[PDB]
Protein backbone atom coordinates (compact mmCIF):
# COMPACT_ATOMS: atom_id res chain seq x y z
CA UNK A 1 0.00 0.00 0.00
CA UNK A 2 1.30 3.44 -1.03
CA UNK A 3 0.47 6.87 0.35
CA UNK A 4 -1.47 9.11 -2.04
CA UNK A 5 -2.43 11.98 0.28
CA UNK A 6 -5.26 13.09 2.55
CA UNK A 7 -8.85 12.06 2.00
CA UNK A 8 -11.57 14.54 1.11
CA UNK A 9 -12.43 16.99 3.88
CA UNK A 10 -15.71 17.91 2.20
CA UNK A 11 -18.63 15.57 2.83
CA UNK A 12 -21.13 16.84 0.25
CA UNK A 13 -19.68 16.04 -3.17
CA UNK A 14 -20.93 18.26 -5.97
CA UNK A 15 -24.08 17.58 -8.03
CA UNK A 16 -23.97 16.45 -11.67
CA UNK A 17 -26.79 16.87 -14.20
CA UNK A 18 -27.03 14.00 -16.69
CA UNK A 19 -28.51 15.02 -20.06
CA UNK A 20 -27.40 12.58 -22.76
CA UNK A 21 -29.38 14.49 -25.39
CA UNK A 22 -26.95 17.41 -25.48
CA UNK A 23 -24.00 15.08 -26.10
CA UNK A 24 -25.73 12.87 -28.70
CA UNK A 25 -24.31 14.27 -31.95
CA UNK A 26 -22.53 13.06 -35.08
CA UNK A 27 -18.98 13.95 -36.13
CA UNK A 28 -17.71 11.12 -38.33
CA UNK A 29 -13.97 10.51 -38.01
CA UNK A 30 -13.50 6.98 -39.35
CA UNK A 31 -10.15 5.20 -39.23
CA UNK A 32 -8.34 6.07 -42.47
CA UNK A 33 -5.59 3.46 -42.85
CA UNK A 34 -4.32 5.11 -46.04
CA UNK A 35 -2.65 7.70 -43.77
CA UNK A 36 -1.70 5.23 -41.00
CA UNK A 37 -4.33 6.13 -38.41
CA UNK A 38 -4.11 4.38 -35.05
CA UNK A 39 -1.07 2.27 -35.94
CA UNK A 40 0.99 0.97 -33.03
CA UNK A 41 4.60 0.79 -34.18
CA UNK A 42 6.28 -2.66 -34.07
CA UNK A 43 7.61 -2.56 -30.51
CA UNK A 44 10.89 -4.35 -30.97
CA UNK A 45 12.61 -2.78 -33.93
CA UNK A 46 12.52 -0.39 -36.88
CA UNK A 47 12.82 -0.47 -40.66
CA UNK A 48 13.82 1.91 -43.46
CA UNK A 49 12.31 2.38 -46.92
CA UNK A 50 10.48 -0.94 -47.33
CA UNK A 51 6.97 -2.39 -47.40
CA UNK A 52 6.17 -5.52 -45.41
CA UNK A 53 3.25 -7.45 -43.97
CA UNK A 54 2.99 -7.53 -40.20
CA UNK A 55 0.67 -9.21 -37.70
CA UNK A 56 -0.27 -7.05 -34.73
CA UNK A 57 -3.09 -5.20 -32.96
CA UNK A 58 -4.67 -2.67 -35.33
CA UNK A 59 -8.16 -1.19 -35.70
CA UNK A 60 -10.53 -1.88 -38.57
CA UNK A 61 -10.20 0.25 -41.67
CA UNK A 62 -13.20 2.56 -41.86
CA UNK A 63 -14.19 1.91 -38.24
CA UNK A 64 -16.09 4.80 -36.68
CA UNK A 65 -15.37 3.99 -33.04
CA UNK A 66 -17.18 5.64 -30.15
CA UNK A 67 -17.22 9.42 -29.76
CA UNK A 68 -17.13 11.18 -26.39
CA UNK A 69 -17.49 14.86 -25.53
CA UNK A 70 -16.66 16.87 -22.41
CA UNK A 71 -18.68 19.95 -21.52
CA UNK A 72 -18.61 22.93 -19.19
CA UNK A 73 -20.90 23.00 -16.19
CA UNK A 74 -23.92 25.07 -15.26
CA UNK A 75 -23.06 28.61 -14.19
CA UNK A 76 -25.09 31.75 -13.43
CA UNK A 77 -22.99 34.82 -14.19
CA UNK A 78 -19.90 34.15 -12.09
CA UNK A 79 -20.92 31.05 -10.10
CA UNK A 80 -20.69 27.47 -11.43
CA UNK A 81 -23.88 25.68 -10.38
CA UNK A 82 -23.41 22.00 -11.23
CA UNK A 83 -21.67 19.56 -13.57
CA UNK A 84 -22.98 18.68 -17.03
CA UNK A 85 -22.03 15.08 -17.84
CA UNK A 86 -23.33 12.29 -20.06
CA UNK A 87 -24.19 8.78 -18.83
CA UNK A 88 -20.77 7.37 -19.79
CA UNK A 89 -20.29 6.11 -16.23
CA UNK A 90 -23.23 3.76 -16.77
CA UNK A 91 -21.80 2.52 -20.08
CA UNK A 92 -19.41 -0.36 -19.35
CA UNK A 93 -17.61 -1.84 -22.37
CA UNK A 94 -15.36 -4.87 -22.86
CA UNK A 95 -11.60 -4.42 -23.08
CA UNK A 96 -10.65 -7.81 -24.55
CA UNK A 97 -7.70 -6.51 -26.60
CA UNK A 98 -7.17 -2.87 -25.68
CA UNK A 99 -8.02 0.21 -27.69
CA UNK A 100 -6.69 3.43 -29.23
CA UNK A 101 -7.91 7.00 -28.77
CA UNK A 102 -7.73 9.96 -31.17
CA UNK A 103 -7.32 13.12 -29.09
CA UNK A 104 -7.61 16.67 -30.36
CA UNK A 105 -8.78 15.99 -33.91
CA UNK A 106 -11.18 18.95 -34.08
CA UNK A 107 -8.85 21.70 -32.89
CA UNK A 108 -8.12 25.20 -34.21
CA UNK A 109 -11.67 25.26 -35.58
CA UNK A 110 -14.99 26.94 -34.85
CA UNK A 111 -17.47 24.71 -33.04
CA UNK A 112 -20.14 25.15 -30.37
CA UNK A 113 -20.44 24.59 -26.63
CA UNK A 114 -22.53 21.67 -25.41
CA UNK A 115 -24.67 23.40 -22.78
CA UNK A 116 -25.13 26.50 -24.95
CA UNK A 117 -26.01 25.28 -28.48
CA UNK A 118 -26.16 28.87 -29.77
CA UNK A 119 -22.59 29.78 -28.77
CA UNK A 120 -19.74 29.57 -31.26
CA UNK A 121 -16.22 29.15 -29.89
CA UNK A 122 -12.77 27.92 -30.86
CA UNK A 123 -12.26 24.28 -29.92
CA UNK A 124 -9.60 23.25 -27.41
CA UNK A 125 -7.89 19.88 -27.09
CA UNK A 126 -8.81 17.94 -23.94
CA UNK A 127 -7.66 14.63 -22.58
CA UNK A 128 -9.81 11.59 -21.71
CA UNK A 129 -10.06 9.75 -18.40
CA UNK A 130 -10.39 5.97 -18.18
CA UNK A 131 -11.27 3.51 -15.42
CA UNK A 132 -10.51 -0.14 -16.20
CA UNK A 133 -11.13 -3.16 -14.03
CA UNK A 134 -11.61 -6.91 -13.69
CA UNK A 135 -15.09 -7.05 -12.11
CA UNK A 136 -18.12 -4.77 -12.45
CA UNK A 137 -21.42 -4.61 -10.59
CA UNK A 138 -24.06 -2.20 -9.39
CA UNK A 139 -23.91 0.90 -7.18
CA UNK A 140 -26.06 1.74 -4.13
CA UNK A 141 -29.38 1.95 -6.02
CA UNK A 142 -28.51 -0.83 -8.46
CA UNK A 143 -26.95 1.70 -10.83
CA UNK A 144 -24.60 0.02 -13.30
CA UNK A 145 -20.92 0.90 -13.25
CA UNK A 146 -19.33 -0.16 -9.94
CA UNK A 147 -15.76 -1.45 -10.03
CA UNK A 148 -14.63 -4.16 -7.60
CA UNK A 149 -11.44 -5.21 -5.85
CA UNK A 150 -8.78 -3.49 -8.01
CA UNK A 151 -9.41 -0.76 -10.59
CA UNK A 152 -6.68 0.73 -12.76
CA UNK A 153 -7.39 4.44 -13.28
CA UNK A 154 -5.86 6.88 -15.78
CA UNK A 155 -6.78 10.52 -15.30
CA UNK A 156 -5.15 13.74 -16.57
CA UNK A 157 -4.60 16.57 -14.11
CA UNK A 158 -3.30 20.12 -13.97
CA UNK A 159 -5.19 21.51 -16.98
CA UNK A 160 -3.77 18.75 -19.17
CA UNK A 161 -0.12 18.97 -18.11
CA UNK A 162 0.25 15.53 -16.48
CA UNK A 163 -1.29 12.05 -16.51
CA UNK A 164 -1.62 9.78 -13.47
CA UNK A 165 -2.24 6.02 -13.36
CA UNK A 166 -2.97 4.04 -10.21
CA UNK A 167 -4.75 1.05 -8.73
CA UNK A 168 -6.03 2.86 -5.63
CA UNK A 169 -9.04 0.65 -4.74
CA UNK A 170 -12.23 2.70 -5.01
CA UNK A 171 -14.43 3.14 -1.94
CA UNK A 172 -17.77 4.89 -2.58
CA UNK A 173 -18.32 7.65 -0.04
CA UNK A 174 -21.67 8.10 1.72
CA UNK A 175 -22.95 11.67 1.61
CA UNK A 176 -25.07 14.11 -0.33
CA UNK A 177 -24.96 13.58 -4.11
CA UNK A 178 -22.29 10.90 -3.58
CA UNK A 179 -22.14 7.26 -4.83
CA UNK A 180 -22.86 5.51 -1.52
CA UNK A 181 -25.06 8.38 -0.31
CA UNK A 182 -28.56 9.57 -1.10
CA UNK A 183 -29.65 11.17 -4.38
CA UNK A 184 -26.85 9.73 -6.50
CA UNK A 185 -26.77 10.33 -10.25
CA UNK A 186 -23.18 9.86 -11.46
CA UNK A 187 -19.63 10.36 -10.24
CA UNK A 188 -17.54 12.86 -12.19
CA UNK A 189 -14.34 14.87 -11.98
CA UNK A 190 -13.90 18.59 -12.50
CA UNK A 191 -11.43 21.47 -12.34
CA UNK A 192 -12.13 25.18 -11.95
CA UNK A 193 -10.16 27.13 -14.60
CA UNK A 194 -10.66 30.38 -12.67
CA UNK A 195 -8.36 29.22 -9.85
CA UNK A 196 -6.76 25.88 -10.80
CA UNK A 197 -5.77 26.94 -14.34
CA UNK A 198 -3.30 29.56 -13.11
CA UNK A 199 -0.45 30.34 -15.49
CA UNK A 200 2.06 30.48 -12.64
CA UNK A 201 0.96 27.17 -11.09
CA UNK A 202 -1.48 24.66 -12.58
CA UNK A 203 -2.93 22.75 -9.62
CA UNK A 204 -1.67 19.21 -10.21
CA UNK A 205 -4.17 17.68 -7.77
CA UNK A 206 -7.42 19.44 -8.73
CA UNK A 207 -8.84 16.52 -10.70
CA UNK A 208 -7.42 14.06 -8.17
CA UNK A 209 -9.21 15.94 -5.39
CA UNK A 210 -12.41 15.99 -7.46
CA UNK A 211 -12.16 12.21 -7.84
CA UNK A 212 -11.42 11.93 -4.11
CA UNK A 213 -14.74 13.57 -3.21
CA UNK A 214 -16.62 10.51 -4.54
CA UNK A 215 -14.19 7.67 -3.75
CA UNK A 216 -11.75 6.91 -0.93
CA UNK A 217 -8.52 5.48 -2.34
CA UNK A 218 -7.78 2.51 -0.08
CA UNK A 219 -4.97 -0.07 -0.19
CA UNK A 220 -3.57 1.87 -3.10
CA UNK A 221 -0.75 0.68 -5.34
CA UNK A 222 1.73 2.35 -7.74
CA UNK A 223 0.84 5.99 -8.42
CA UNK A 224 2.94 7.19 -11.35
CA UNK A 225 2.84 10.51 -13.21
CA UNK A 226 3.86 11.52 -16.73
CA UNK A 227 4.45 15.07 -17.94
CA UNK A 228 2.74 16.49 -21.04
CA UNK A 229 3.79 19.63 -22.92
CA UNK A 230 0.88 21.87 -23.95
CA UNK A 231 -0.03 22.30 -27.61
CA UNK A 232 -3.05 22.00 -29.91
CA UNK A 233 -1.80 19.13 -32.07
CA UNK A 234 -3.74 15.97 -32.85
CA UNK A 235 -2.34 12.99 -30.96
CA UNK A 236 -2.96 9.30 -30.35
CA UNK A 237 -3.03 7.16 -27.22
CA UNK A 238 -3.15 3.37 -27.05
CA UNK A 239 -3.42 0.75 -24.34
CA UNK A 240 -2.95 -3.04 -24.38
CA UNK A 241 -2.27 -5.81 -21.86
CA UNK A 242 0.03 -8.83 -21.82
CA UNK A 243 1.78 -11.03 -19.26
CA UNK A 244 4.20 -8.12 -18.65
CA UNK A 245 1.33 -5.96 -17.41
CA UNK A 246 -0.58 -3.11 -19.00
CA UNK A 247 1.26 -1.34 -21.81
CA UNK A 248 0.54 2.34 -22.49
CA UNK A 249 1.20 3.87 -25.89
CA UNK A 250 1.22 7.40 -27.27
CA UNK A 251 2.58 9.49 -30.11
CA UNK A 252 3.98 12.52 -28.31
CA UNK A 253 7.50 11.56 -27.25
CA UNK A 254 8.65 10.08 -30.58
CA UNK A 255 6.26 11.01 -33.40
CA UNK A 256 4.45 14.28 -32.71
CA UNK A 257 3.67 15.55 -36.23
CA UNK A 258 3.01 11.96 -37.33
CA UNK A 259 0.91 9.71 -35.14
CA UNK A 260 2.82 6.45 -34.91
CA UNK A 261 2.36 5.22 -31.35
CA UNK A 262 5.31 4.06 -29.25
CA UNK A 263 5.31 2.48 -25.81
CA UNK A 264 6.14 4.91 -23.02
CA UNK A 265 5.09 3.00 -19.90
CA UNK A 266 4.34 -0.41 -18.43
CA UNK A 267 2.18 -1.01 -15.36
CA UNK A 268 2.32 -3.90 -12.85
CA UNK A 269 -1.35 -4.65 -13.53
CA UNK A 270 -1.30 -8.44 -13.93
CA UNK A 271 -5.02 -9.06 -13.44
CA UNK A 272 -6.97 -9.71 -16.64
CA UNK A 273 -8.85 -6.52 -17.52
CA UNK A 274 -12.26 -7.45 -18.90
CA UNK A 275 -14.14 -4.15 -18.54
CA UNK A 276 -13.47 -0.43 -18.83
CA UNK A 277 -15.38 2.83 -18.80
CA UNK A 278 -14.98 6.51 -19.53
CA UNK A 279 -14.92 8.95 -16.61
CA UNK A 280 -17.05 12.08 -17.18
CA UNK A 281 -15.36 15.43 -16.68
CA UNK A 282 -17.02 18.85 -16.51
CA UNK A 283 -15.28 22.23 -16.47
CA UNK A 284 -16.53 24.56 -13.72
CA UNK A 285 -15.92 27.70 -15.76
CA UNK A 286 -17.68 31.06 -15.76
CA UNK A 287 -20.95 31.39 -17.67
CA UNK A 288 -19.35 34.27 -19.60
CA UNK A 289 -16.06 32.35 -20.05
CA UNK A 290 -16.58 28.93 -21.66
CA UNK A 291 -14.62 27.02 -24.29
CA UNK A 292 -15.36 24.17 -26.70
CA UNK A 293 -13.64 20.91 -25.78
CA UNK A 294 -12.80 18.63 -28.70
CA UNK A 295 -14.44 15.22 -28.74
CA UNK A 296 -12.26 12.13 -28.61
CA UNK A 297 -12.84 8.83 -30.39
CA UNK A 298 -12.08 5.32 -29.11
CA UNK A 299 -11.46 2.43 -31.51
CA UNK A 300 -11.00 -1.20 -30.52
CA UNK A 301 -8.01 -3.33 -31.53
CA UNK A 302 -8.01 -6.73 -33.23
CA UNK A 303 -5.31 -9.26 -34.23
CA UNK A 304 -5.15 -8.41 -37.92
CA UNK A 305 -2.56 -8.56 -40.69
CA UNK A 306 -1.48 -5.23 -42.18
CA UNK A 307 0.72 -4.12 -45.06
CA UNK A 308 2.90 -1.31 -43.70
CA UNK A 309 5.12 1.09 -45.65
CA UNK A 310 8.19 2.32 -43.77
CA UNK A 311 9.91 5.38 -45.22
CA UNK A 312 13.60 6.30 -45.03
CA UNK A 313 13.20 7.95 -41.63
CA UNK A 314 11.45 4.80 -40.41
CA UNK A 315 7.91 6.11 -39.93
CA UNK A 316 4.76 4.35 -41.14
CA UNK A 317 3.09 6.91 -43.40
CA UNK A 318 0.67 4.47 -45.04
CA UNK A 319 -0.76 1.00 -44.48
CA UNK A 320 -3.34 -1.38 -45.94
CA UNK A 321 -5.84 -3.50 -43.98
CA UNK A 322 -5.55 -6.88 -45.68
CA UNK A 323 -9.05 -8.02 -44.75
CA UNK A 324 -11.04 -4.91 -45.65
CA UNK A 325 -12.08 -5.75 -49.22
CA UNK A 326 -10.88 -7.71 -52.26
CA UNK A 327 -8.55 -4.99 -53.56
CA UNK A 328 -6.87 -4.91 -50.15
CA UNK A 329 -6.42 -8.69 -50.29
CA UNK A 330 -4.82 -8.29 -53.72
CA UNK A 331 -2.46 -5.61 -52.41
CA UNK A 332 -1.40 -7.76 -49.46
CA UNK A 333 -1.02 -10.92 -51.57
CA UNK A 334 1.58 -9.18 -53.74
CA UNK A 335 2.68 -7.16 -50.66
CA UNK A 336 2.91 -4.02 -52.76
CA UNK A 337 0.98 -0.77 -53.08
CA UNK A 338 0.79 -1.10 -56.89
CA UNK A 339 -0.96 -4.12 -58.42
CA UNK A 340 -0.89 -4.73 -62.17
CA UNK B 1 -4.45 -33.79 -83.31
CA UNK B 2 -2.12 -31.11 -81.97
CA UNK B 3 -2.90 -29.82 -78.49
CA UNK B 4 -2.48 -26.08 -77.95
CA UNK B 5 -3.94 -25.39 -74.49
CA UNK B 6 -4.82 -26.86 -71.13
CA UNK B 7 -7.88 -26.11 -69.03
CA UNK B 8 -7.46 -22.91 -67.02
CA UNK B 9 -7.97 -23.58 -63.32
CA UNK B 10 -7.81 -21.23 -60.32
CA UNK B 11 -8.28 -22.46 -56.77
CA UNK B 12 -9.43 -20.50 -53.73
CA UNK B 13 -6.59 -21.58 -51.44
CA UNK B 14 -8.12 -20.15 -48.25
CA UNK B 15 -11.48 -21.86 -48.80
CA UNK B 16 -9.88 -25.07 -50.06
CA UNK B 17 -7.71 -25.46 -46.94
CA UNK B 18 -10.24 -24.30 -44.32
CA UNK B 19 -13.66 -24.23 -46.10
CA UNK B 20 -15.18 -21.44 -44.04
CA UNK B 21 -14.37 -22.44 -40.47
CA UNK B 22 -13.08 -19.39 -38.61
CA UNK B 23 -10.85 -21.45 -36.30
CA UNK B 24 -8.87 -22.82 -39.24
CA UNK B 25 -8.42 -19.31 -40.68
CA UNK B 26 -6.41 -18.16 -37.65
CA UNK B 27 -4.34 -21.36 -37.73
CA UNK B 28 -3.56 -20.82 -41.41
CA UNK B 29 -2.90 -17.08 -40.95
CA UNK B 30 0.48 -17.83 -39.33
CA UNK B 31 1.53 -19.90 -42.36
CA UNK B 32 1.93 -16.59 -44.21
CA UNK B 33 2.35 -16.40 -47.97
CA UNK B 34 1.83 -19.98 -49.12
CA UNK B 35 -1.69 -19.45 -50.47
CA UNK B 36 -0.46 -16.23 -52.10
CA UNK B 37 2.30 -18.10 -53.93
CA UNK B 38 -0.19 -20.70 -55.16
CA UNK B 39 -2.56 -17.98 -56.40
CA UNK B 40 0.18 -16.02 -58.15
CA UNK B 41 1.57 -19.12 -59.86
CA UNK B 42 -1.88 -20.08 -61.16
CA UNK B 43 -2.54 -16.51 -62.32
CA UNK B 44 0.73 -16.45 -64.25
CA UNK B 45 0.01 -19.81 -65.86
CA UNK B 46 -3.41 -18.61 -67.04
CA UNK B 47 -1.92 -15.38 -68.42
CA UNK B 48 0.64 -17.40 -70.38
CA UNK B 49 -2.14 -19.64 -71.72
CA UNK C 1 35.23 -0.56 -37.63
CA UNK C 2 36.22 -2.92 -40.45
CA UNK C 3 36.96 -6.06 -38.41
CA UNK C 4 34.78 -9.16 -38.18
CA UNK C 5 33.79 -9.19 -34.50
CA UNK C 6 31.35 -10.96 -32.25
CA UNK C 7 28.71 -8.63 -30.85
CA UNK C 8 26.15 -8.69 -28.02
CA UNK C 9 24.05 -5.52 -27.93
CA UNK C 10 21.22 -5.35 -25.36
CA UNK C 11 20.52 -9.06 -25.67
CA UNK C 12 20.96 -9.38 -29.45
CA UNK C 13 24.07 -11.38 -30.35
CA UNK C 14 25.86 -12.41 -33.51
CA UNK C 15 28.93 -11.87 -35.65
CA UNK C 16 29.51 -9.15 -38.22
CA UNK C 17 31.34 -6.05 -39.38
CA UNK C 18 30.28 -2.61 -38.17
CA UNK C 19 30.67 0.59 -40.17
CA UNK C 20 29.86 4.29 -39.93
CA UNK C 21 26.94 5.49 -42.05
CA UNK C 22 24.14 8.05 -42.16
CA UNK C 23 21.30 7.30 -39.77
CA UNK C 24 18.09 5.63 -40.96
CA UNK C 25 15.03 4.35 -39.15
CA UNK C 26 13.83 5.72 -35.84
CA UNK C 27 16.41 6.29 -33.12
CA UNK C 28 14.39 5.11 -30.11
CA UNK C 29 14.20 1.61 -31.62
CA UNK C 30 17.99 1.15 -31.86
CA UNK C 31 17.85 -2.08 -33.87
CA UNK C 32 17.29 -1.52 -37.60
CA UNK C 33 16.19 -4.65 -39.44
CA UNK C 34 15.58 -5.42 -43.11
CA UNK C 35 12.73 -7.17 -44.94
CA UNK C 36 13.90 -10.68 -44.02
CA UNK C 37 14.59 -10.15 -40.30
CA UNK C 38 18.32 -9.47 -40.56
CA UNK C 39 19.92 -6.79 -38.40
CA UNK C 40 21.46 -4.15 -40.68
CA UNK C 41 21.82 -1.17 -38.36
CA UNK C 42 22.42 -0.18 -34.77
CA UNK C 43 22.12 3.05 -32.78
CA UNK C 44 25.06 2.97 -30.38
CA UNK C 45 25.22 4.57 -26.94
CA UNK C 46 28.08 6.75 -28.22
CA UNK C 47 25.58 8.62 -30.41
CA UNK C 48 26.40 7.09 -33.79
CA UNK C 49 24.52 4.93 -36.27
Curated annotation (Swiss-Prot), chain C:
Residues carrying covalently attached carbohydrate according to the record: 20
Domain of life from the UniProt record: Viruses
Entry function: Attaches the virion to the cell membrane by interacting with host receptor, initiating the infection. Interacts with host DPP4 to mediate virla entry.
Name assigned to this protein: Spike protein S1
Classification lineage: Viruses, Riboviria, Orthornavirae, Pisuviricota, Pisoniviricetes
Residues shown, of full length: 600 to 648 of 1353
Amino acid sequence: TVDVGPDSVKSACIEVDIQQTFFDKTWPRPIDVSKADGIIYPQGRTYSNITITYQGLFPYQGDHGDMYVYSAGHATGTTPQKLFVANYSQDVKQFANGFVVRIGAAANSTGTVIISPSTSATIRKIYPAFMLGSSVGNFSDGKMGRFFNHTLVLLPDGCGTLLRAFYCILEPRSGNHCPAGNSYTSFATYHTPATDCSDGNYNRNASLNSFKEYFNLRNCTFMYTYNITEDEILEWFGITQTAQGVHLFSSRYVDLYGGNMFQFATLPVYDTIKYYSIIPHSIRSIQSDRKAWAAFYVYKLQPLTFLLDFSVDGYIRRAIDCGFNDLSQLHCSYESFDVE
Amino acid sequence: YIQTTIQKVTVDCKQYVCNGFQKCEQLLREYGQFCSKINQALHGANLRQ
Amino acid sequence: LGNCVEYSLYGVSGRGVFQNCTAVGVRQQRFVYDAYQNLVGYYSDDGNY
